Amino acid sequence: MGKGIIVRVPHGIELSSELLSALEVRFPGYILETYYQKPDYHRSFARRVDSLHKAFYFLIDAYPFSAKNTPLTKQTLKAYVDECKLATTDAKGSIDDLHKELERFTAKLIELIALNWGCSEIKEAVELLNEAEQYALMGEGRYDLVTLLPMQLGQDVDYVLQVDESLPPYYDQLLDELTLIKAKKYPKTPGWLRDLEEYQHAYFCNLDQGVTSYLEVIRDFNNFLLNWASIKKIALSLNSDLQQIVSGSPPLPSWFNGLSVHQREMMRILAADPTSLDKKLTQFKKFLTGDIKWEIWDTATQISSLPQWYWVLSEHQQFFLEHVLKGVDDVKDAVSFLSSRHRTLPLPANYAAHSLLGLSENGNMRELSAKRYRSSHIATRDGLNWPKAVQQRHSDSNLAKVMEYSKNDQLAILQTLISPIHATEYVPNWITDYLPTLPPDLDLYKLARSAVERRKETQSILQNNHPYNMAKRLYYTQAYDKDSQSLLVTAKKYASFTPGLQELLDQYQSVLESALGTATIFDYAGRELFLSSLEQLIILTIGGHSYGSCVSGKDRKAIELIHTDAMILYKECYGTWPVFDELPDKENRIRFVSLVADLYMSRHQHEHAGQNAPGSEGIKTPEWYLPEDIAAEIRKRLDSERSLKDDDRAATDNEVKNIFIGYLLPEKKLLCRLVARQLGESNCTKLYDALHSLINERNLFTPQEQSSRWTSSFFSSESNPTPDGIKQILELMLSPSSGKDNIIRIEKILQVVSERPEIDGSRTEATNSVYGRLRSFLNCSEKATTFSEIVSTTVEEWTKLFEESKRAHVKEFESSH
C-alpha cells in the first residue's frame, strides 16, 4: 500500500518550481489536481455512478448467485450494467437533473441485483450494492489529500495547506486473524450458529482446543453442571459472586477463575440475570443432545479457531472479505483503509491525521499545527445487536489503535461530537434525515465510556462530548458540564510552565459560562465550535495527543477541523486568537468568517468525506452546525440559497438507500428484456421468423368446443376461439420489423408469455409449443443447454407444426375440387 498523494490546487495558478519542489519533498510522488471556486456537481455525479458500477462488478465477482435463480450469464449482466453506465455520460444540467439520473441509474442496478440474486426484499439488494462498494474501496486503498490555498499571513507563509494523511488501521492481532481466515479457506457462518442465544454463542466461540469432538462437548458441559451444583452448595452468597462478575471487577470468585475459557465466558453472560441462570443451563444440556446434533457434530469444535467478530458477519460480508483477502499476498494490503460506513470489522474507519501547513513563495514549509487525528466513532453502530464481547473487541481495539501516537504519560483527549437522545425524547427531524429508528449516538456514547474505563490502567484519557441537537428542546454542552471541569482542572496544572495556555483557559471558561446569561438571540452553534476548538487548542499547546470523532468522522468532525484551522490561521495573521464574544458587525468577526468560509469552500474536507463513498463529496447539515454569519457568507459568495443544502445532498448520497431520500420496471419486464438481449439478434430473428409463419396459421390455436364447461355462450370457446396471448402476439407482429427490431419484439412477446398460466389442459398442441418453448427461455433448464440449442429445437418444432398445417389445408382444398 502507500497508495499516493493528491494535492488540490486552485485552477489557474502557476506554481514556481521552488514550490512544486517543496511539495515533492513533503509529498513524494504526489499528483496535482485542479479545483475551482464553484463546486462541480457533474464531477460528483460521474464519481458516484462510476463507483457503484465498480461496486456491481465487485459484487458479481465476489458473491455467488445460485444458477437456479435465472438463465442469465454474468456476461449478459455486466454488459447491461455497462450500458446503463454509458447512458449517464450524456447527463447534463442542474444538481437536480443529475440527482435524478443518479437515482435512475442506481434503481436499475438494485433491481438487476434483486432479480439475479433472488432477493425476497428489495432492501437486501440495496445492502448488497452498498456493502460491495465499501469492500471494493477497502481493497483499493486511499490517497492522502492535500489542499493548497493561497493566503498571506506572514512573510513566511504565502500558501496555506490543509493536509489529511491516511493511516493504516490494522494491528497485529487482526492481521493474525486474517491470516487464519485464509488458511481455513474462508469458512462461512453456519445458520445454527447465528440462531444461538448470547451465552451459547460464547460457549462455542470460546471453546478450548482441548475439546476435539462433539462427544467431548457433551461431556464437557455435563462436567460443568456437576461442578456447578457443587459450587452452589459451597459458595457463601451466590449473588455477590455473580454481581462481581457482571461488574467484572476483582476480586472474582475463585471457582470462576479456574473455569475453562468457554465455561467462563458463558457464565459471564448468565451472571447478568441470576434468576434464569439454572433454567438456561438445563436448557443448553437439552439443546446439545437435541435435534441440532445431526447438523453440528462435525463442525461445532471448529468454530473457536476463528474469532467471534468474524462469525457474526453476514454471509455476504464474508464473501466480500474473502474476495479482497484472496487478492493479496500480504493480508495488510487487504485492509489499508476502511470507509466510514464500514463498521463491521474491528479496526478504525476513516482514520487519518489532519494537519495545517504554511508554505512560502521560495519553498519553505512551516508546520502551523501538529497532527490531529480523526476517525469514525470508536464504537460500532453496525454491531448494536451483536454479543457484548464483539461489541467491545471493536471499541477496545479501535480505542487502542486511535491512541497509538499518544505516549502513555502525556495528555490525551477523546473528543466526540455526537448527540445521545433517549427514545422517550426523540423527534425525527431534518438533522437526522427523518430516520424512524433511534440514532445510535446514545449507545455509542456509553460504549466509548466503557472502553476508556477498561483502558484506565494503561493510559488516562480526557473525554469530552459536544452534543448539538434539537428535539423537544435544544441539546448542547451545559455550562456546568463535568468533563469540562476535569479538563479545566487538569489543564490549569500546566499554566505556569506552558506558554500561551492561560489565555486559552480564560477563553474556554468564558465560552462555557456564556450559556448561563440570556439574550433572546444566542449563537449556540458557534459556542459549540468554540468549545470544541479551544479544547483542541489547549491539548495542542500543552503538547498532548489530539483525537476526536463524530459518528462517521466526516461531518461534525470536518467542521471542527475547519474551525480550528481557521483559529490557527487567524492567530497567525492578526497576532491573537479570535473569540466567541464578538459582534457580527465588527472587523474581527468578519475576518474570522472570511477564513472559515475560505476553508469550507476549498472543499478539502468535502473531498475527504468523498473518499468514503466517491461522488459523496459534501458535508452533512451545514446550516445546522454553522453559525448564521458563516453560512450566510458562504451562501452569498456562491450566490445560492441552496449551496449548503447541496452539500448535504451530496453527503447523504454516501449510503445507497439514501440516494432515494431526495423507478422499478414492472412484474417480469427486466428478465424478458435481458433474456432477449442474451438471445441476440441472430437468435431472436430465427425465433421471430419461425413464429411469424406458425402464428399466422391461426386455426391451430382454436381449441375444441367444450360444451360441458360453458354455461353462457358469451364466454364460450366458440365465441372466443383464439387465446388472448396468441391474439396479442399477432398484434405485436402486425407491423413489419427487421434486425435489431426483432430483439424488442421478442422482449415483448416474452412479456406476454410470462403472464400466461403454466398449465391449461384445453390448449392445442401449437399453443403449448408457442407458450412452452418461449417460456423455456425465462427459466433455467434442467440439464444446462444453450439458448442457441433451445432456439434450434424450438425452430424445428415450430417449423414442423407450420408445414403439417400448410399441407392439411392443401389436402382439405383437394376435398373441394
From TrEMBL:
UniProt domain Phosphoinositide phosphatase insertion: residue ranges: 189-281
Alphabetical list of Gene3D superfamilies matching this protein: 1.10.520.60, 1.20.120.1720
The organism's place on the tree of life at top rank: Bacteria
One of the Pfam families matching this protein, by short name: PI_PP_C
Coiled-coil ranges (or none): none
Residue ranges annotated for the Phosphoinositide phosphatase C-terminal domain, each copy included: 678-806
Protein name: Uncharacterized protein
Source organism (scientific name): Legionella longbeachae serogroup 1 (strain NSW150)
Taxonomic path: Bacteria, Pseudomonadati, Pseudomonadota, Gammaproteobacteria, Legionellales
